[PDB]
Amino acid sequence: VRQVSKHAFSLKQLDNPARIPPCGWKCSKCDMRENLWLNLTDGSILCGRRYFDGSGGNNHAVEHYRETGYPLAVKLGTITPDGADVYSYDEDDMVLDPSLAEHLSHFGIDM
């Protein structure tokens, strides 16, 4: 079972966030329109990491975590009323975010 993040009840989300619509996303740093991760601190939309077999993206979301420390990201296209795929860069694991509806509503997203 995925464990609840240590950040789920303490996450600081930045002021004056930009709204995120329900589709049309692109990585800000490359052409990818799939495997995109919404950082829950700042609403950045950046591609997933590259793996040893060539799978995955161009590491833009994990690069962004390394620059900012902003720990949680949600995989766009996985959000339903019951949850989403949430990764914690700080905790090195997929995690549950019981505050995900609040965190997504910060960006105008209705789970």
Ligand SMILES: O=C(O)CNC(=O)c1ccc(S(=O)(=O)N2CCC(c3ccccc3)CC2)cc1F
């Ligand atoms: O990429 C981002 O910026 C944000 N996400 C992540 O860092 C992330 C990290 C780990 C996981 S994992 O442990 O489930 N696993 C997902 C399959 C991976 C795999 C790759 C090649 C062949 C077989 C398996 C191994 C890691 C899922 C993730 F989404």
Ligand SMILES: [Zn+2]
């Ligand atoms: Zn990218």
